[PDB]
Design a protein around this nucleic acid. Structure first.
Ligand code: CTN
Ligand code: CTN
Ligand code: CA
Ligand code: CA
Ligand code: ZN
Ligand code: ZN
Lengths: 543, 543
DNA sequence: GTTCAAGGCCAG
DNA sequence: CTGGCCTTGAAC
């Protein structure tokens, strides 16, 4: 499917591909290996599919966060560049290409938020958030705002929050801890409450989105806005005289934006891994290669030290690199999705004032965080055998998705409330945006009883955006051959996909919800026999 | 429009009207004069309009504060009850129905804040505010707060503030002094700093509102709350065992809640003024009449001495009357509105810590306190004639309303700062809530110049909730007769209603902003002639 | 003395 | 087979 002696490179349309193609022409001139660069559409989507088939490009350029998902699917070769080459680039950029303890791509370019101020309105920008209210009151008298940015999305408000002891997941020796989230913290609450103190006094109306702040800053209304290089071009045509500089410091500590690293990764299916490493290390990652790419379309800051020094002569790019070094690498692991969501609401609720700060942040932390089951508890509660009728507690492992896999976890029995009802209360306390459907998956020790089938099927009638599937280990009946079969048929009428957990489902649960301590799943005796038994009884019930 | 030999009575819906109707039935049984009681909606709003047309009710029941606004519009008949009858009611209640030196209504009922405590948690309530922090530390150990009330509104926090030499306006014999405000005082600062000392140690979280404190007290969390009789019914259904007692004393002096007096006023347009006085003096204001009204819906404490003694057997009502006698009558004059606002913010800014105490209180006092303009200075500075070009200070009288007339005053020239810019700095230092529009009115010696016009029109672009109208005595100029006209046309574009002061405007200013010593306005020669002349030049300028 | 995981036997 | 019922070894 994929050739030898030929290099195929995939790069997005907004990044300069003509300069990269000219680099490949230099590589072909010197070596004889012909290089072809392509800028397809949705290549961040196209690449996983074509690569799962042993096809696709030899090299893939994209932001480093997606590369973690590519690395979990084994689509990326491991690279071991000499430490003599690892120096050549800034050290923190090599951490963005590290997944599960091994390097999966080459750092190329750097992006991060930075402070954009009006030089005419502000000849000397403030170095601290603490000076912002005062400044605003002086500029609210000329009909101007001091600062406006995209307060809705968490990528923009997060730097102030994380400036003081705030973080998503602690990093260590090239691996994140999904169990630990610094969303709830003294300093995170300090930054968020400072934000709220700005919006209460209406230094920021709190309804500000990206376009309201871009229209505001670009038409001369606001003196400062927090944004990245992606928008620079616009401000250059607005004729506004401006500048980029360090994001202000809260409590004296630098604020921490989320750094995105444009990276070049190697397809694991490629026979040209070494050809690729030679091209990347000796032709792309040079002053001449990155400059040739840059003249076509900007790269922002670059990871290559020498060329980054040549580019820092631009004060804007210098600011980008400075805020990047004072910030934190945007994590590449899956749980980050559940993070964004769990934060995207928590700031908004604390912004409008419809929820207090510590409530929004505690709810955010416990939402986007790990809770893992026990192994002995799981093995005991989920055994599908005979003689399992003597089990009382029902356990329920859940996954909420849309495909963005949001929160996951497990619930158990508590004071007469069967688990299904507790999940109804959990997903009800959790707000919903009924313009988008959600796909909710259940893994239950016992299938729902009649009361649970009726309550759940009703909840499903009322929120028709939700679509539920239920995998149960065991079929529950009290007063056999009357009620629960009709209840399960009632959930069937409501369109609930009811299956009985097969072996692959027990693997999924074992590696998804349980704390296995890297232990392989161990099937007990009679698992498959009881599974096709119970699935037979179920096919007898519904149909 | 309004009948003779018939009495029509207006009373709010929350006050017992069936008992009052039975009193009117007794009056009809004795005299033959039929009495009809009605409880319309927004009768406090409906009454001024219907009465301005010589219509409406014969008698109106409402809190005494609104009656001052009815008295200024001449809608209330003056009453001269014999001293023998005035001795029947408590003397301080007669000061609440006194406006501009003459009685306008009959006192009926009395309301005031009182201390409500949990008898189970607190068998012996503290008599002094000084004991409150210690008691809180003892109850913070059982999971309870000692005291929680509505710290947002000034009606609730004012008793402690005024406990030591604090007051709104000094009252010399039924007459308030708008020029004197005791908001800034040694004892006022003592009470406010003690409140801040309670919120720094978090004996009160300072975000507490009326409903947070009612839910807290009624669910058993807090041991004491400061409230009035309006909420008693709720605490009765909460099954909480409680009591009402004296508000605690600060520095040994009784704290001063604001006393509200439910009053019965006579419509000045009624031919039945004497029928009304007979019904009120001999049928309503009796033990039998007030008891008949009370059995239907409670009146709280009453102004009639004998029946008040009969009701004091209820220790709650006795507490209400005691705090009322130790408090001060809530003034009925218009400036009280500027008072509430100027105080509502001043305590909040001193509560959060975003403004020091003496700053919040000095800003509050100078905010809500009259400030009046020398007659000679006004007459000199506002003369519209010719030969007025030789005047170089510019004065500006302002009114800020929403309807709701907040602060008024005048402003003048400074070291190169024209007035308009000084007013921009004043209304900027004054905070704004950009969810509500404000209507600001100007009265200026000179119309704004080009720099003024531009700065003001910009301020209006940035704060689009403000709507400005400018009345000017004179039109200003400087060579570029071109400009002073284009600047005024730019303010016209911004939506500023520009008019030139007519005679009625001079009357308004003369009786609103000037210290006239009760002297009628004296127009100089050529006022009207120069007025239509300048108005002609202005029409010629804008259109 | 007791409660439970597990498994087998027998009668529908 | 599916469901009902005893035996057991072994664990608090
Ligand atoms: N869907 C279901 C059905 C049943 N159960 C368990 O069975 C008992 C009902 O009497 C309950 O004690 C309950 O533990 C459950 O947990 N979930
Ligand atoms: N709109 C205006 C215009 C002018 N002025 C006062 O009049 C003088 C004009 O030179 C100036 O000295 C200035 O003080 C003013 O007070 N307000
Ligand atoms: Ca969770
Ligand atoms: Ca004032
Ligand atoms: Zn159930
Ligand atoms: Zn001016």
């Amino acid at each position: 499917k994929i050739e030898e002696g030929k290099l195929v490179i995939w790069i997005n349309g907004d990044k300069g591909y003509n300069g990269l193609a000219e680099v490949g022409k230099k590589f072909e001139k010197d070596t004889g290996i012909k290089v072809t660069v392509e800028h397809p559409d949705k290549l961040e989507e196209k690449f996983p599919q074509v690569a799962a088939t042993g096809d696709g490009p030899d090299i893939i350029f994209w932001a480093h966060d997606r590369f973690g998902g590519y690395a979990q699917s084994g689509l990326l070769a491991e690279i071991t560049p000499d430490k003599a080459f690892q120096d050549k680039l800034y050290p923190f950029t090599w951490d963005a290409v590290r997944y599960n303890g091994k390097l999966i791509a080459y750092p190329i370019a750097v992006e991060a938020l930075s402070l954009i101020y009006n030089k005419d309105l502000l000849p000397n920008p403030p170095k601290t958030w603490e000076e912002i209210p005062a400044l605003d009151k002086e500029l609210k008298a000329k009909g101007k705002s001091a600062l406006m940015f995209n307060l809705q999305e968490p990528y923009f408000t997060w730097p102030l929050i994380a400036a003081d002891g705030g973080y998503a997941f602690k990093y260590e020796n090239g691996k994140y801890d999904i169990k630990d989230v610094g969303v709830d913290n003294a300093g995170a609450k300090a930054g968020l409450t400072f934000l709220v103190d700005l919006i209460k006094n209406k230094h920021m109306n709190a309804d500000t989105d990206y376009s309201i702040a871009e229209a505001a800053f670009n038409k001369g209304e606001t003196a400062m806005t927090i944004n990245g290089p992606w928008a620079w071009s616009n401000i250059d045509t607005s004729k506004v005289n401006y500048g980029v500089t360090v994001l202000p410091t809260f409590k004296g500590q630098p604020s921490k934006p989320f750094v995105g690293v444009l990276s070049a990764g190697i397809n694991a299916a490629s026979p040209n891994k070494e050809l690729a490493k030679e091209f990347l290390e000796n032709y792309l990652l040079t002053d001449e290669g990155l400059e040739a790419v840059n003249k076509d379309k900007p790269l922002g800051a670059v990871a290559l030290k020498s060329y980054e020094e040549e580019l820092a002569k631009d004060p804007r790019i210098a600011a980008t690199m400075e805020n990047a070094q004072k910030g934190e690498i945007m994590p590449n692991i899956p749980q980050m999705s559940a993070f964004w969501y769990a934060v995207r609401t928590a700031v908004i609720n604390a912004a409008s004032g419809r929820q207090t700060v510590d409530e929004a942040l505690k709810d955010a932390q416990t939402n986007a965080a790990a809770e893992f089951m026990d192994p002995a508890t799981f093995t005991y509660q989920f055994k599908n055998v005979r003689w399992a009728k003597g089990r009382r507690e029902t356990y329920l492992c859940y996954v909420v998705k849309r495909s963005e896999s949001l929160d996951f976890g497990y619930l158990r029995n508590k004071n007469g409330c069967h688990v299904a009802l507790l999940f109804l209360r959990y997903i009800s306390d959790w707000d919903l945006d009924p313009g988008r459907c959600y796909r909710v998956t259940w893994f239950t020790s016992w299938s729902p009883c009649y009361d649970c089938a009726r309550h759940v099927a009703d909840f499903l009638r009322g929120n028709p955006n939700l679509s539920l599937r239920i995998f149960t280990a065991r079929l529950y009946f009290c007063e056999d051959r009357k009620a629960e079969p009709e209840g399960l048929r009632r959930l069937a009428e409501a369109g609930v996909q009811i299956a009985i957990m097969t072996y692959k489902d027990y693997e999924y649960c074992w590696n998804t919800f349980v704390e296995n301590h890297e232990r392989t799943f161990k099937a007990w005796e009679g698992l498959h026999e009881n599974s096709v038994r119970l699935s037979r009884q179920l096919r007898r019930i519904l149909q």
